[PDB]
């Protein structure tokens, strides 16, 4: 019973400009997820740092599954992210050879 709301790297309805505040100046493989710019289908947007730029990868949501491209194979956003911590996004696009290495946490350090 994992909830996306508890994910360190899930920042909800923040904007791309707000994401850039968190990803600017970071290392390759730094990442967070926000809601997509539009609510259609309940998609999400992964933002991943590479080469000093922010790469945005749509997380499609269809029929209760999630993925970057068809076929959608993941049962939750958390499961998707956990997969790409270990497997490079070269699986999505051969030219995007980066893993999800450094989550940007929304929580205070306490």
């Amino acid at each position: 019973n994992m909830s996306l709301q508890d994910a360190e790297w899930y920042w909800g309805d923040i904007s791309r400009e707000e994401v850039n505040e968190k990803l600017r100046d970071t290392a390759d493989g730094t990442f967070l997820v926000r809601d997509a710019s539009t609510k259609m289908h309940g998609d999400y947007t992964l933002t991943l740092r590479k080469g000093g730029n922010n790469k945005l990868i749509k997380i499609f949501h269809r029929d209760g599954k999630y993925g970057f491209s068809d076929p959608l194979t993941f049962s939750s956003v958390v499961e998707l992210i956990n997969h790409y911590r270990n497997e490079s996004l070269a699986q999505y696009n051969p030219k995007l050879d980066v893993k999800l290495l450094y989550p940007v946490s929304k929580y205070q350090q306490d």
Partner: peptide
Amino acid sequence: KDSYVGDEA
């Protein structure tokens, strides 16, 4: 720059 990444080349 913020860029969407597509699945084609």
